[PDB]
Design a protein around this nucleic acid. Sequence first.
RNA 1: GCUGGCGACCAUAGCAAGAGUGAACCACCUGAUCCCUUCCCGAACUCAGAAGUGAAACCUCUUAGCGCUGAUGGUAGUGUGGGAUUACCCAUGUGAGAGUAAGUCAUCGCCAGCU
RNA 2: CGGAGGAGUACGAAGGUGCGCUCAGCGUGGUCGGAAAUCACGCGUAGAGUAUAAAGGCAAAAGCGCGCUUAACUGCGAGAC
Lengths: 76, 137, 174, 115, 97
Amino acid sequence: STKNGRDSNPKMLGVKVYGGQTVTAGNIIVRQRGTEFHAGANVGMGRDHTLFATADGVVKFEVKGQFGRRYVKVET
Amino acid sequence: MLQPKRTKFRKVHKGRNTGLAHRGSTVSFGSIAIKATERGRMTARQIEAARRTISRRIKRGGKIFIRVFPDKPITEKPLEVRMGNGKGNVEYWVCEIKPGKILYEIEGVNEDLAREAFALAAAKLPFKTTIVTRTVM
Amino acid sequence: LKARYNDELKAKLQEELSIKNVMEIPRITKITLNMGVGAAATDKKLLDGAVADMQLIAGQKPVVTLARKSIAGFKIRDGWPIGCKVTLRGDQMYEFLDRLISIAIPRIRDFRGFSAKSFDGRGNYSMGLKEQIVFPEIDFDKIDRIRGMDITITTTARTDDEGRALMRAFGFPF
Amino acid sequence: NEKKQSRLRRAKSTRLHIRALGATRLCVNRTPRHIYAQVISADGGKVLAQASTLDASLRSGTTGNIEAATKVGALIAERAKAAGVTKVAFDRSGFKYHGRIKALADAAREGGLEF
Amino acid sequence: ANFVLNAQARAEDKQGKGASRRLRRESLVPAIIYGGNAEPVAVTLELRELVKALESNVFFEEVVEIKVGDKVENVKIQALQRHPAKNTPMHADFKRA
RNA sequence: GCUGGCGACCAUAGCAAGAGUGAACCACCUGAUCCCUUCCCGAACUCAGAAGUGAAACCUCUUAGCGCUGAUGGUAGUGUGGGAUUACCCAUGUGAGAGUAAGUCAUCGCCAGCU
RNA sequence: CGGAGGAGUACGAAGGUGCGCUCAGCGUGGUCGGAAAUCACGCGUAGAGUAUAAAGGCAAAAGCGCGCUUAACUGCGAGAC
C-alpha cells in the first residue's frame, strides 16, 4: 500500500487580460499567488495579490524600476 | 560499485534518451580515451568490470580516469506481483549514455598497451565504442 | 582630561606621528563596559546586583542585553537577558578613563596584565579586568558575588601604531 | 557614512506614497546653515515655485534657525499662490517633523497652502 | 603561405540548416572569416583539404591563406566544430591576421 | 564652467583602485542653555552657532582589474507534408543556450546659487 | 492502489495606525567563557526571518521594535474571476 495519493483542487491562476486589450474599471487582470506582477498606474492590488483595473483604458505590460519588476498599468 | 552517497529523491521517472553528447566528448584528463558511438545504459557493475579489466591489463603503471557516474536509480517489481500497487523498489543504478560520450581515459602508458586494454574493456560493454586521442582543437 | 588632552596631546601626537592634518590626529570616541552574566536565569539576582555595580562605577543607567538565538549547549533561551552593557562618551568617558587609570591600576594585586599588543588591528583596544572591587564602591562587604568587566575603547586611529601612541599619551601601563 | 543613506531610506516611503496619490508635492531640505522649500508637480520632474535662505532678502540673516525657516515658509507660500497651487502634500524628506521644518510648514499653512 | 585552402563563396541561399546539411552531404565544410576593420565573409571549404591541414600540428600556430577566386585572406584558425561521435569537422572559424 | 535639490533611466550606466576639490554650496566641526532625544549614551534625532579642516565623507576625472553588454557563422530544438522506429532522414518555414570577434568607466530633464 | 509532504489550528495582539530599525555568516581582539552566551571593529555577502507544510512572494520591506488604540465596524456595492 502506497503512502501517496493526495493532491489539491486546481486554482485557475494566470493572466486574464493581455496587453493591448481594453478594460472596464473592476476587471481582474492577473490572478497570482505572489506578486509576480506589480500594480502600475490605474491598477489596484487585492488582499490576495490579485491585480484589477481602477479605470477604463488599455492594458499595458512593462519592465521598470531599479529592481526590474514587472508592472501592468492601464492607459486612459 | 559506484552510487551516490545520498539522493534528494528515491525514485525517478523513466525518461527518454535522445540527442548527442556535445558535452563530455573531448579528451581532457589523459592522452588516449575510449568513447561510445551509440546510445544506451551503463550499469555500475559494467563500469566496475571495465575498470578492473583496464587496470589489470595496464598493471597500474598509469592513471585511469573514469568519466561516467551512475546517478540514475532503476526500480523493479518484486516478481510474481500484479500490476499496480505503487512503484517498485530500487534495484541498481545506471548512467545514461549518448553517442560521443567518453567513458575512460588513460594517462602515462604507451598507445599500444592502452589500445590493448581498451579492446579488452570493449568486450564488457553493451554498446559500440571507438578510440580517440588528444588533439589541439 | 578633556581640556588637558586638547591642549597637549593633539599637537604632541601630531608632531610625533608626522600627521599633516589635525583631523587625522587620533581621538577617543567611546568606552564600552560589558559583562556576559550567563546562567542568570537560575538566580535572577546577580544581574540586579550587576546593574547597581554599573550605576556605581559609571554614572550612567545600564541596559540589560538579551541573547540573540538560543543555544542548547548553553542554557540561553531565544531572548532571555544574559548580559549587561553601558556606553560612555564625551566628558563622562574621560572621567571614567582618568578615574580608572589613576586608582584602579595600582589596586589590582598583579601588574603588567595589559600588554602593548591586543589591539584589534584597527586602533581600538579591549580590556579584561577581574573583580568589581578596585573601584569607588564598597569593599567585599555589602556586595554580592564578585564580577569582572570588559572595557573596549574605540578610537579614530586607523591602525595599531596610532592607537598605541594615542593611549600611551593618556598614560596606560603599556 | 550611513547618515545620509538612512535619511533617504526614511524619505522613500513618503515620496512614493505622494507620487502614487498624484498630488502636488512640497519638498523641504535642511542643512545646518540653510533651509530650502520647493513645490514640485505631480509627475515629480518640474518645479513650480521655490524659496530658500539663499534669497537676497534673507541671506543677510542668520539663515540657520527657526526664525529664518518661518520667513522661508511665508515666501514659499506667497510664491506658490502666484504660481496657482492650493492643495499640496508635505514631504519632510526623512527629517523629523519638528523645529525648523515644523515652523516652515506652519508658516506655509498661514500663508495659505492647504495641508 | 605554406598552408593554402581553396574555397568558394557561401551565399545567403547556401546559408542555413538545410543548406549546410546539403553542403556536408556534398563533402564540403562551412566556415566563417571575421576580424578587424572588415565585415565577416562566409566560405565553403573542402573536407579533404581541411582534414589534411588539421593532421599537421603547425597549422594551428601559422598564418594560412584562404583563397576564393582572386581574393586572398590571411587568417589563423580560431575555432573548429566536430561531430560528437564521428569526429568529422563540421564548421570552421577564421580570424583575420 | 563648479555646487545643491527633485526626476527620467536601472550596470555599455555597476563595483574596485588611483588622483583632485573649499569664493559660494555641502560636509565634517563647537556644546547641550531653552525645543526634542537615547529600553544607557547629544552615537543617531533636535536645538543655538561659526574657532578649525577639506582628513573622513560626498562629488569630479583616469584605468578594462572584476563585472556587464555582445555580433556573424554553425549546432540543438521545433510547426506542416513525406519516409523510418533508440528517436532519426528529406522538403519547407522557424531558430536558441553556450562559446568567439567586439563594445562599455553612461545619456537626458526642471529649478536655484557661484563666477 | 503514480512520486513527495501538510491540515481538522493559533492570535485582543501575532489586528489598526504614526514613528523608527535591519538579518545570517566569517575574521580580529576582549574575565570566568569555551566549538558556540555578551562587548567592540571590520570583511564579503540575502545565504536570516516571515505562528505553521510547500509554492509563489517580500525595501514603501509583507521581516523587526515603541506609543496610542479597536476598521477583527454598520448599510451597501459599479465591475470582474
